């Protein structure tokens, strides 16, 4: 159920525009996914229901900006 | 000019050193987590192989 | 002052690029070591499954 959180953040805000190369997908996806998913376990709770509110914009913007900028 | 150049060089050196230390700590933590996940995956694969 | 500021900016940019390249090389080496350890653990688990 992590397709909505990872697909509704990089393909909506602007996190996937900085890493459009094919070689950066493994390091950016593994580092951002493992660092963002391991540093915050509450974000998975957003996949337990609907979303599209303050938790989706705050968790997606902070997790996408911190995970995409700290990789 | 000397104060701004020394402050910019010291801030750039401190930021590059802190970013390198944070990247080394993140790489070491990622390597240790990958080793623990590989050991847990090997133990789970051995237990599943024994049960199978 | 102009040569010191330009040399300090070029040295800071070169130090940041070298530190980022060294961090990327260290992360790639750690990922390769983790992949080799995971492959060795998978081979040991397969050999233990065949022996079992």
UniProtKB/Swiss-Prot annotation, chain A:
Compartments reported by the entry: Cell inner membrane
Superkingdom as given in the UniProt entry: Bacteria
Cysteines engaged in disulfide bonds, as pairs: none
Coiled-coil stretches: none
Subunit structure: F-type ATPases have 2 components, CF(1) - the catalytic core - and CF(0) - the membrane proton channel. CF(1) has five subunits: alpha(3), beta(3), gamma(1), delta(1), epsilon(1). CF(0) has three main subunits: a(1), b(2) and c(9-12). The alpha and beta chains form an alternating ring which encloses part of the gamma chain. CF(1) is attached to CF(0) by a central stalk formed by the gamma and epsilon chains, while a peripheral stalk is formed by the delta and b chains.
Function: Produces ATP from ADP in the presence of a proton gradient across the membrane. The alpha chain is a regulatory subunit.
The family this protein is said to belong to: Belongs to the ATPase alpha/beta chains family.
Protein name: ATP synthase subunit alpha
UniProt source species: Escherichia coli O45:K1 (strain S88 / ExPEC)
Designated gene of the protein: atpA
UniProtKB/Swiss-Prot annotation, chains B, C:
A GO CC term assigned to this protein in UniProt: plasma membrane
Keyword Nucleus: no
Principal cellular location given in the protein's record: membrane
Subcellular location(s) of the protein: Cell inner membrane
Keywords: ATP synthesis, Cell inner membrane, Cell membrane, CF(0), Hydrogen ion transport, Ion transport, Membrane, Transmembrane, Transmembrane helix, Transport
This protein's record includes keyword Glycosyltransferase: no
GO molecular function: proton-transporting ATP synthase activity, rotational mechanism; proton-transporting ATPase activity, rotational mechanism
Similarity field: Belongs to the ATPase B chain family.
Described function: F(1)F(0) ATP synthase produces ATP from ADP in the presence of a proton or sodium gradient. F-type ATPases consist of two structural domains, F(1) containing the extramembraneous catalytic core and F(0) containing the membrane proton channel, linked together by a central stalk and a peripheral stalk. During catalysis, ATP synthesis in the catalytic domain of F(1) is coupled via a rotary mechanism of the central stalk subunits to proton translocation.
Assembly notes: F-type ATPases have 2 components, F(1) - the catalytic core - and F(0) - the membrane proton channel. F(1) has five subunits: alpha(3), beta(3), gamma(1), delta(1), epsilon(1). F(0) has three main subunits: a(1), b(2) and c(10-14). The alpha and beta chains form an alternating ring which encloses part of the gamma chain. F(1) is attached to F(0) by a central stalk formed by the gamma and epsilon chains, while a peripheral stalk is formed by the delta and b chains.
Protein name as it appears in the record: ATP synthase subunit b
């Amino acid at each position: 159920v992590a397709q909505q959180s990872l697909v509704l953040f990089a393909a909506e805000r602007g996190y996937l525009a900085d890493v459009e190369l094919s070689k950066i997908g493994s390091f950016e996806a593994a580092l951002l996914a493992y660092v963002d998913r391991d540093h915050a376990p509450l974000m998975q709770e957003i996949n337990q229901t609907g979303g599209y509110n303050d938790e989706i914009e705050g968790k997606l913007k902070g997790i996408l900006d911190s995970f995409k900028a700290t990789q | 000019l000397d104060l701004a150049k020394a402050s910019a060089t010291d801030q750039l050196k401190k930021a590059k050193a802190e970013a390198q230390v944070i990247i080394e700590q993140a790489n070491k933590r990622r390597s240790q987590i990958l080793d623990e996940a590989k050991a847990e995956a090997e133990q789970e694969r051995t237990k599943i192989v024994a049960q199978a």
